[PDB]
Write a protein that binds this ligand. Structure first.
Ligand SMILES: [Fe+3]
Length: 836
C-alpha cells in the first residue's frame, strides 16, 4: 500500500488548568507515547457493508516533534503514521482514544498524504477524557464544510450519531467529562432548603415570568421544593464550553467567584469588626479610593493579596491598602460628572446608551394596566418645559423632533411598594430632555413617582424637578438625577446587559450544538461568537444572579431583580434587537434611502448609534457573503434539515415562551437567515461590548453611577433639607450605595471591564484554520479589513471637535466600538463573544 504521515497537536492539562497555572528537557511527553493514545482514521469515500465509512487500524502516537513553524505556546506535537492505501479511499474523519487517565486538549490533526490528494487538516479543539468513560469513541471530522446533504455518503450516519450523542437526551445528572447539550428553566437560583426567605421563583415555562432557557445541569431537586434544583459549588457545562488559559490572570471568572467566595467575607471583617469608617462622609473620601486607597488590617490584606488572578486588579502600596484604578470618567476633570450636559450625554455614549426615545406625544403615557399614572399619564406639564432656550412651544419641539424621553416608570412601579419596605427607598422616574441648537442634549425635567398615594387604584403620586445651577435647589436637582441614575443602573444591569446579551444568547448555543454538525457552514459562522458564554452564565447562576448574590445585594431592584427582568422579557422581540430596527422603534432614526446605512438619525451625534451602525453593517455584509456562498437558492435553505430542526428547537423550546409570537423569521428565505445570524452576532459581539466595557470607566466612580438609593428626597422644611443646605455631599452620600456595597460593586465591575490577554476579537479574528474553503477565508479577510477601515473612521470622529457628544465635559472619547484593543481596562475592543 503506503503510509499517511500524521501530526497531532495537543495541549497538556497542566498548561491550561487554573490550579496548575497560578504560577505562569525535564520532558513529560514521553508518557503520551507508548500505548497511551490511539487514533483510527475513517474513510470518507469507501464504505463498509452498510454504508458506513471503513476504519483504518488504531494507531498509537509515535514520537515527539520538537519544533514546527506553527506550533505555539503550550502546544506539544507528535508524529504518527497511518498504514493506508489506494482502495481505503480518502480519510474524512477519525477516532481518538486516550488511555491515559489525565485528559488533554486535542487541538488538531494534519495528514500529509497520498494521491494527487493534498494535506487534510482537522481542527478539533476538544478535551479528550479517558476512553473508558465513553461507549462510542471520540469522533472528529476534517476541515471541509458541508450542508447536510451530510455530505460524503460514508460519513452521513456518523454525522447524525454525533449529534444524537451531543443531545443526550434529557435525564441524568451531568458530569464534568460530558458533552451534552439541553435546556432547563431558571429553577436554580434560590436556596429554599436554607429557608423560604431564599426561595426564588422559577423563570420560564410559565406566563407570569417567561424567560430564555439555560443549559441543563441535571442535579437533584431540592428537599423542600421539587421544582427547584439543589445548589452546587460546581455547575456543569458541556466540557469544552469551559475555556482554559495559559496565563494566570486571564481566568477572569475565577476572580469573580473569588470576590464573593473570598473577598466579601473578609471585607466585612474590617467593617462587621471596625478598621475603616462604615460610610463615606465627603466626595473626597470616595476619590481617595483611587489615590491612597482604603487602608486595611495586615491579617486580611494577606488573605486578599496572595490569591489567584486578583494580583493586577487591586493596587497595594507599601502594605495595608486596597487601591482602585482611577476611572476614565474622572481622569481629566473630577467634577464634570455633575454637569447636566454629561448626565444627558451618557444616555447617548454611556454604559446604557440604548434607552432614549423620541417623545411623539405629550404628556408621556404608561402602558401599565388600570390605575391612572398609566391609562392616561406623566404629570410633567408644558410650563415645566422651556427655561433659557429657544422659545418653541412643546408641540413645535415635538414636531421638530427635539424632545426625548428616558422612561423608567413602568417596570419598577408594580414592585415599588415591596422594594420600599426594605432599606432601599426608590422612585419610578421619567426624564425629558431637549436637543439644543448646539447639538448637545439637556435634561429639562425629572419626574419622581411613588405608588398608591392611597391604594394602587388611580395611582401615580409624582413630583416634578427642574434644572437648578445654584444653591439648595441645585443639590435637590443633583439628587433628582441620582434617583434617575439608580433606576438606569439597575435596568442596565438586569436588562440591557444580563437579559439582552447573556441570557438570550444561551439558547442559541444549545440549539446550535444540538442540531448543526461541527461541519455545517452555519455552525462555523456562529461558533466563535459563543466562546466562554455558557461558562460565564453558569457562574452568574452560582454567584451573580442568585439568592444571596452580588446583583441582589447591589442594585436597586433587590430581591426582585431577576423576576423583574422576566417581566421585561415579556416585551423582548428578536428582530428589534437588530440595531436599525432598535433605533426606529425608539424614534431615534427614520427609514431613509438617501443616507449611508438606509437610516437618517434624529440626533446625528449619538455616538453609540453612529458607531454601531458601522459595525452592524460590516457584520451583515460578512453574514450575507457567507450565507450566499453556501445556499444556492432559498429552496436549499428550506431543504436543510439541520438548519430547520435547529431553528424549530430555538423557537419552540429555547426561547419557548415566545413560540407563538409572529415576528420570528421563518427560515424560508436566505435573507431571513442572514437577518437572524446578524442579530445573534450583533448581540454577542458589539451590543455586549457597548453595554459591558464602559461599566468601570463610567461607574467606577459610584457618585456618577450609583446603584441604589436609600433615602427619599428631603422635603420643604424638615431637618434633612437643612442638612442638605449644610453638607449636601453628605446628603448625597446618604442617599446612594453605601461604602460596603460600593466596594463590592467596584471589585466586580473592574473585572467585568477588562479584557483577558487571550481574547479573540471581531476584528477579523478567529482561533486557527477552521475551513478548507478558500472563498470563505477570503470573505472573512474582507470582513477584518472593513473593521480595520471602520477603526480609522471612528478614531477620526473622536478627533472631530464639532462632535461634542463623543467627548463631553469629561473629555472621554467614545471608543467602546473600536474593534481592536490591547487588554485590561481599556475603553474599547469588541470580543467575538459574551466572554465576561
Ligand atoms: Fe457581560
Amino acid at each position: 500500500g503506503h503510509k499517511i504521515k500524521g501530526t497531532v497537536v495537543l495541549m497538556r492539562k497542566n498548561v491550561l488548568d487554573v490550579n496548575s497555572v497560578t504560577s505562569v528537557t525535564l520532558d513529560t511527553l514521553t508518557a503520551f507515547l507508548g500505548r497511551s493514545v490511539s487514533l483510527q482514521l475513517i474513510s470518507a469515500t469507501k464504505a463498509d457493508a452498510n454504508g458506513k465509512g471503513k476504519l483504518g487500524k488504531a494507531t498509537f502516537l509515535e514520537g515527539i516533534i520538537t519544533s514546527l513553524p506553527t506550533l505555539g505556546a503550550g502546544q506539544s506535537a507528535f508524529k504518527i503514521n497511518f498504514e493506508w492505501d489506494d482502495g481505503s479511499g480518502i480519510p474524512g474523519a477519525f477516532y481518538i482514544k486516550n488511555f491515559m487517565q489525565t485528559e488533554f486538549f486535542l487541538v488538531s490533526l494534519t495528514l500529509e498524504d497520498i494521491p494527487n490528494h493534498g494535506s487534510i487538516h482537522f481542527v478539533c479543539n476538544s478535551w479528550i477524557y479517558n476512553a473508558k468513560l465513553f461507549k462510542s469513541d471520540r469522533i472528529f471530522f476534517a476541515n471541509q464544510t458541508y450542508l447536510p446533504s451530510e455530505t460524503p455518503a460514508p460519513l452521513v450516519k456518523y454525522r447524525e450519531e454525533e449529534l444524537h450523542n451531543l443531545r443526550g437526551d434529557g435525564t441524568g445528572e451531568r458530569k464534568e467529562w460530558e458533552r451534552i447539550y439541553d435546556y432547563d428553566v431558571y429553577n436554580d437560583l434560590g436556596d429554599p432548603d436554607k429557608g423560604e426567605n431564599h426561595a426564588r421563583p422559577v423563570l420560564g415555562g410559565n406566563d407570569t415570568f417567561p424567560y430564555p432557557r439555560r443549559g441543563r445541569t441535571g442535579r437533584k431537586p431540592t428537599r423542600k421544593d421539587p421544582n427547584s434544583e439543589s445548589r452546587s459549588n460546581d455547575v456543569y457545562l458541556p466540557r469544552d464550553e469551559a475555556f482554559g488559559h495559559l496565563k494566570s490572570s486571564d481566568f477572569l471568572t475565577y476572580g469573580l467567584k473569588s470576590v464573593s467566595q473570598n473577598v466579601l467575607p473578609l471585607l466585612q471583617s474590617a467593617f462587621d469588626l471596625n478598621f475603616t469608617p462604615r460610610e463615606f462622609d465627603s466626595f473626597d473620601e470616595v476619590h481617595g479610593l483611587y489615590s491612597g486607597g482604603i487602608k486595611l488590617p495586615t491579617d486580611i490584606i494577606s488573605k486578599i493579596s496572595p490569591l489567584p488572578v486578583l494580583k493586577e486588579i487591586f493596587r497595594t502600596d507599601g502594605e495595608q491598602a486596597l487601591k482602585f484604578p482611577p476611572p476614565k470618567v474622572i481622569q481629566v476633570s473630577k467634577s464634570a460628572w455633575m454637569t447636566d450636559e454629561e448626565f444627558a450625554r451618557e444616555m447617548l455614549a454611556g454604559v446604557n446608551p440604548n434607552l432614549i426615545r423620541c417623545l411623539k406625544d405629550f404628556p408621556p403615557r404608561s402602558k401599565l394596566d388600570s390605575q391612572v399614572y398609566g391609562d392616561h399619564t406623566s404629570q410633567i406639564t408644558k410650563e415645566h418645559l422651556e427655561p433659557n432656550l429657544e422659545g418653541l412651544t412643546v408641540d413645535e419641539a415635538i414636531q421638530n423632533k427635539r424632545l426625548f424621553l428616558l422612561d423608567h416608570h413602568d417596570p419598577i412601579m408594580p414592585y415599588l411598594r415591596r422594594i420600599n419596605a426594605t432599606s432601599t427607598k426608590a422612585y419610578a422616574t421619567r426624564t425629558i430632555l431637549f436637543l439644543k441648537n448646539d447639538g448637545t442634549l439637556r435634561p429639562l425635567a425629572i419626574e419622581l413617582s411613588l405608588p398608591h398615594p392611597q391604594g394602587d387604584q388611580s395611582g401615580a403620586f409624582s413630583q416634578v424637578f427642574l434644572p437648578a445651577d445654584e444653591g439648595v435647589e441645585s443639590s435637590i436637582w443633583l439628587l433628582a438625577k441620582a434617583y434617575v441614575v439608580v433606576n438606569d443602573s439597575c435596568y442596565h444591569q438586569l436588562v440591557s446587559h444580563w437579559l439582552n446579551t447573556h441570557a438570550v444568547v444561551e439558547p442559541f448555543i444549545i440549539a446550535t450544538n444540538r442540531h448543526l454538525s461541527v461541519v455545517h457552514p452555519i455552525y462555523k459562522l456562529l461558533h466563535p461568537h459563543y466562546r466562554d458564554t455558557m461558562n460565564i452564565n453558569g457562574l452568574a447562576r452560582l454567584s451573580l444572579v442568585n439568592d444571596g448574590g452580588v446583583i441582589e445585594q447591589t442594585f436597586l431592584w433587590g430581591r426582585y431583580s431577576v423576576e423583574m427582568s422576566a417581566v421585561v422579557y415579556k416585551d423582548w422581540v428578536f428582530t428589534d434587537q437588530a440595531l436599525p430596527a432598535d433605533l426606529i422603534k425608539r424614534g431615534m432614526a427614520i427609514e431613509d434611502p438617501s443616507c449611508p446605512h438606509g437610516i437618517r438619525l434624529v440626533i446625528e451625534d449619538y455616538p453609540y448609534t453612529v458607531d454601531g451602525l458601522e459595525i452592524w453593517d460590516a457584520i451583515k455584509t460578512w453574514v450575507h457573503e457567507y450565507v450566499f456562498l453556501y445556499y444556492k437558492s432559498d429552496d436549499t435553505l428550506r431543504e436543510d434539515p439541520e438548519l430547520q430542526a435547529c431553528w424549530k428547537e430555538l423557537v419552540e423550546v429555547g426561547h419557548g415562551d415566545k413560540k407563538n409570537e409572529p415576528w420570528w423569521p421563518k427560515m424560508q428565505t436566505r435573507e431571513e437567515l442572514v437577518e437572524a445570524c446578524a442579530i445573534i452576532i450583533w448581540t454577542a459581539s458589539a451590543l455586549h461590548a457597548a453595554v459591558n466595557f464602559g461599566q468601570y470607566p463610567y461607574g467606577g466612580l459610584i457618585l456618577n453611577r450609583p446603584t441604589l438609593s436609600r433615602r427619599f428626597m428631603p422635603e420643604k422644611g424638615s431637618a434633612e433639607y437643612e442638612e442638605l443646605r449644610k453638607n449636601p455631599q453628605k446628603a448625597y452620600l446618604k442617599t446612594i450605595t453605601p461604602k460596603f456595597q460600593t466596594l463590592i460593586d467596584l471589585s466586580v465591575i473592574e473585572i467585568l471591564s477588562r479584557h483577558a490577554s487571550d481574547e479573540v476579537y471581531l476584528g477579523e479574528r478567529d482561533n486557527p484554520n477552521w475551513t478548507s474553503d478558500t472563498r470563505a477565508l477570503e470573505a472573512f479577510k474582507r470582513f477584518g479589513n472593513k473593521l480595520a477601515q471602520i477603526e480609522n473612521k471612528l478614531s477620526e470622529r473622536n478627533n472631530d471637535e464639532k462632535l461634542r457628544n463623543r467627548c463631553g465635559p469629561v473629555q472621554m472619547p467614545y471608543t467602546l466600538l473600536l474593534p481592536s484593543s490591547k487588554e485590561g481596562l481599556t475603553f474599547r475592543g469588541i470580543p467575538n463573544s459574551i466572554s465576561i
